[PDB]
Ligand SMILES: *[C@@H]1O[C@H](CO)[C@@H](O[C@@H]2O[C@H](CO)[C@@H](O[C@@H]3O[C@H](CO)[C@@H](O)[C@H](O[C@H]4O[C@H](CO)[C@@H](O)[C@H](O)[C@@H]4O)[C@@H]3O)[C@H](O)[C@H]2NC(C)=O)[C@H](O)[C@H]1NC(C)=O
Ligand SMILES: *[C@@H]1O[C@H](CO)[C@@H](O[C@@H]2O[C@H](CO)[C@@H](O[C@@H]3O[C@H](CO)[C@@H](O)[C@H](O)[C@@H]3O)[C@H](O)[C@H]2NC(C)=O)[C@H](O)[C@H]1NC(C)=O
Ligand SMILES: *[C@@H]1O[C@H](CO[C@@H]2O[C@@H](C)[C@@H](O)[C@@H](O)[C@@H]2O)[C@@H](O[C@@H]2O[C@H](CO)[C@@H](O)[C@H](O)[C@H]2NC(C)=O)[C@H](O)[C@H]1NC(C)=O
Ligand SMILES: *[C@@H]1O[C@H](CO[C@@H]2O[C@@H](C)[C@@H](O)[C@@H](O)[C@@H]2O)[C@@H](O[C@@H]2O[C@H](CO)[C@@H](O)[C@H](O)[C@H]2NC(C)=O)[C@H](O)[C@H]1NC(C)=O
Ligand SMILES: *[C@@H]1O[C@H](CO)[C@@H](O[C@@H]2O[C@H](CO)[C@@H](O)[C@H](O)[C@H]2NC(C)=O)[C@H](O)[C@H]1NC(C)=O
Ligand SMILES: OC[C@@]1(CC[C@]23C[C@H]4C[C@H](C[C@H](C4)C2)C3)NC[C@H](O)[C@@H](O)[C@@H]1O
Ligand SMILES: [Cl-]
Ligand SMILES: [Cl-]
Ligand SMILES: [Cl-]
């Protein structure tokens with residue numbers, strides 16, 4: 044009865060350290076590990092729920108679940124309702140609820156799945172129809188459903204699982220008795236800790252390169268325990284079990300299927316993809332202007348200037364100080380005149396200590412009842428930057444209207460172009476409130492997940508505090524998401540164009556409203572390497588607008604780290620160099636000449652690729668695609684890609700192999716089966732001085748590891764054969780770069796074929812796709828010809844000038860190159876690199892044929 048294989052033992056004492064006699068009193072097995080693995084575990088006969096009255100409906104199945112024996116948790120719910128909904132051929136949905144009480148809820152034609160049920164003990168079993176593989180099997184462990192403890196377990200189809208943000212972790216999670224805690228917490232990224240966001244979704248790989256996803260729509264504090272059997276347990280402290288299974292079968296379809304439920308990523312403004320520069324320490328408009336002057340003088344592109352707390356009067360939202368920032372409005376107007384945008388920090392918490400009538404955000408907030416309240420009905424008061432603060436309740440419709448007013452009124456004074464929303468966990472410098480927290484079951488729950496500080500109140504507000512929709516106990520993990528939604532709506536109403544919101548704290552569905560940065564990362568080689576897995580993870584979770592503070596945030600960067608960090612960072616979909624108050628400068632212009640050259644090249648390559656990056660965001664927005672994706676998403680059938688997380692792809696075609704260690708002049712990277720062209724063979728124009736010329740022009744891979752030259756001034760980037768990439772001429776801003784002629788990079792297959800596309804619009808209007816205010820073009824290389832295919836042509840993109848076509852993998856020098864049947868003014872062929880470079884005078888929006896032979 045206690046003869047359970049060690050790796051299949053499920054913990055019967057997750058609540059407390061337990062003696063043998065207590066363990067056996069619970070009706071559990073006690074076998075000490077020989078060296079983690081639980082000593083106290085469930086026998087296969089431990090009491091669970093019994094399935095009763097299973098019935099067929101027109102959507103799927105309904106049943107009653109009955110527990111006859113209570114668990115060791117208080118307030119077992121002995122009668123549950125099961126609903127199974129076969130929603131699409133790709134998406135299965137099942138809920139387990141209390142039929143007696145409404146509980147908190149987060150606000151061959153054939154399906155790819157089959158579902159069967161275990162009667163006693165109760166379990167859901169989901170097979171993949173095609174190969175009979177078991178994806179979900181909840182029979183492996185008892186179902187627990189108590190007022191403040193849900194546990195649902197399943198076998199996993201392999202040792203390969205990714206998701207469950209936000210943690211400092213490899214892309215593929217360890218199944219060695221790993222506890223993953225989802226409780227939004229302000230903490231500098233460190234391993235084994237709950238960080239700023241919670242995404243209760245995983246993607247599981249199966250032998251052969253199929254995959255499925257599971258989403259638990261639950262916003263309560265929870266542990267996810269992985270064991271080596273392999274298996275997984277969801278342990279939540281409230282709500283209901285609301286479970287979605289996505290059948291894929293391709294990993295990219297899993298991600299698309301998940302985003303069909305939580306939302307497709309928002310379309311950023313084009314300028315949002317340029318270079319951002321920030322720090323705490325730009326303590327006046329004069330110093331802030333000097334940053335732009337210094338970047339401009341050294342030929343470094345800069346689209347967006349930011350300010351941290353510096354701009355505020357006494358660290359209060361919707362103010363500016365009359366010392367260093369007296370002429371704030373004029374500074375932001377000047378930035379706009381020069382073709383740049385402005386971003387500034389906004390904190391959730393609102394200063395509560397000012398004299399009444401002297402601070403409108405608090406005075407208005409108090410009048411409209413916008414704030415989170417405590418037991419006695421008064422605003423819950425914490426401590427953040429301004430001192431004593433109340434916290435807005437972004438679940439309250441009146442708070443959304445108040446937020447829109449405060450943003451619009453401040454925007455009438457200073458025309459900021461977006462919002463950087465920090466501290467939205469929400470973060471508290473004290474525990475709970477100025478008045479502590481009451482002694483109740485929400486503040487002291489029977490199961491506390493493995494949160495840093497061992498309490499739900501640590502570095503945040505009281506769990507029993509009141510919000511419009513529910514207690515903070517249920518809503519905490521949404522707080523940042525609700526502010527991102529509020530801020531997104533505020534900016535649409537204020538500016539009338541696409542909003543740009545960067546948020547620290549996130550929940551599943553965040554990407555529909557805002558982007559993310561990975562927070563207070565150390566300026567270390569370790570945190571540099573760790574940023575690639577984290578950026579890839581947020582792309583799988585539908586938050587493609589993500590990056591880490593380029594050169595690191597905490598501590599002092601070195602010159603070499605900042606060169607390597609700027610090289611990889613130029614391939615973050617969101618690229619911002621941000622620096623702590625206590626740190627040495629790390630602006631690109633503050634380094635030695637050779638270091639500036641390397642940094643200038645990385646920024647130049649990024650700006651050249653912006654039309655391609657923008658098109659990748661269009662695909663994310665319209666089809667639920669990833670922008671930065673791991674190799675395994677593009678090559679799931681090659682099991683060598685599965686654990687690769689120190690390389691990334693942009694879309695299908697661009698493979699980035701960064702150096703992530705000090706003292707290295709080479710890097711070993713994995714190259715999936717196919718030809719990979721070195722991007723160094725494509726000509727790129729820069730406004731300033733670039734590094735001097737130093738490698739193999741093309742890598743012919745069978746699926747293998749390849750060592751590449753990677754000197755300090757180099758990052759390895761390869762273009763996949765069979766893809767065409769649109770590029771645009773240089774600029775110090777996107778305002779300048781968008782006016783430049785465009786170029787095509789055509790990577791020919793062995794058979795002489797390639798395909799690509801360009802999406803173009805005005806770069807910031809709302810409702811572009813619905814109004815049809817865009818141009819979409821496809822490029823096809825075949826039989827020594829390149830043509831464009833006009834999917835849509837409008838005023839926006841009509842007069843795009845194509846002036847350069849670079850063809851990679853051209854075997855022999857051509858005797859003639861034609862543009863629309865006429866010999867071209869000029870072309871060069873390199874027999875060494877096999878590159879054909881062609882000057883042309885064509886329009887993206889007008890049919891052309893370029894031919895050679
Ligand atoms: C819900 O939130 C509200 C805030 O919105 C919060 O109100 C606070 O109540 C405490 C006391 O319970 C107040 O503290 C007082 O501060 C004044 C000075 O401003 C002092 O005179 C008071 O001192 C008396 O009590 C002390 C006990 O420590 C004695 O040492 C002393 O000798 C006095 O007898 C007292 O410290 C606080 O000012 C308000 N906050 C605000 C901003 O009004 C309320 O308590 C919260 N409810 C719960 C249940 O947490
Ligand atoms: C879903 O997971 C459950 C639990 O892991 C699996 O059910 C278990 O299956 C094993 C192997 O079939 C059972 O052991 C066997 O039982 C038979 C009959 O009692 C016995 O003759 C064999 O010698 C063997 O011991 C085990 O009892 C059973 N557990 C329960 C609680 O039913 C099940 O296989 C999984 N379902 C699928 C489709 O994978
Ligand atoms: C399982 O269902 C039976 C039968 O319930 C009836 O048929 C169902 C399809 C549905 O239409 C119900 O509303 C009906 O009541 C339940 O057994 C019945 O229990 C009720 C109330 O105790 C009683 O009036 C009847 O005599 C019972 N009928 C029979 C034939 O046994 C049973 O309780 C359900 N099980 C659970 C745990 O909910
Ligand atoms: C980050 O560096 C600062 C400053 O370092 C000093 O100045 C630089 C030009 C460089 O040459 C360093 O080697 C210098 O030491 C550090 O701030 C120092 O803090 C200590 C107090 O702990 C103080 O005695 C120094 O004078 C400070 N210097 C200044 C100018 O403030 C800071 O500690 C470094 N941070 C980390 C985490 O290493
Ligand atoms: C912008 O660049 C200027 C010029 O390099 C910097 O001003 C110099 O700063 C050094 C210290 O590094 C001083 O010793 C010099 O007196 C300054 N020179 C001039 C011409 O003013 C300035 O610090 C940079 N500003 C920012 C915000 O980066
Ligand atoms: O707006 C101030 C900061 C940083 C605050 C500090 C964090 C560390 C380093 C430094 C000193 C204190 C401890 C406060 C700055 N808030 C948190 C954000 O994650 C930072 O991007 C932001 O710049
Ligand atoms: Cl013991
Ligand atoms: Cl509720
Ligand atoms: Cl391998």
Ligand SMILES: [Cl-]
Pocket residue numbers: 812813814815
């Ligand atoms: Cl249309």
